[PDB]
């Protein structure tokens, strides 16, 4: 299943979650994690795991892997999750997100 992992502009976590949901619905085999930088070094995270994915791949665990790296927190379910953190290293956050997904798919 395809994978979208990216850093994007968004005005709120609610918008970010809704964008993730629409991407997953428009291409239902896809799993998606978006990170959105915000002021003061904060970064928002929203993700969603495709319904067809391997059962060991859960959204909460994915978000936690990324947000814990960013000194933050995550919450959610096996299907959708969110979190926040702060970081100056978007490349590292993206790499954790992509490598985690590839290891669980
Ligand atoms: Ca499957």
Residue numbers in the entry: 881 to 985
Extract from the study:
Consistent with its absence from primate mt tRNAAla sequences, the human mt AlaRS/tRNAAla system was recently shown to be insensitive to a G3:U70 identity element. For the human mt AlaRS/tRNAAla system we show that loss of the G3:U70 identity element was accompanied by a radical reorganization of the recognition mechanism, away from sequence-specific direct readout in the acceptor stem to sequence-unspecific structural readout of the flexible tRNA elbow. The appended C-Ala domain, which plays an auxiliary role in prokaryotic AlaRSs and is dispensable for aminoacylation in the human cytoplasmic AlaRS system, plays a central role as a folding aid for the intrinsically flexible mt tRNA elbow. Fine-tuned induced-fit adaptation selects mt tRNAAla and rejects non-cognate mt tRNAs.
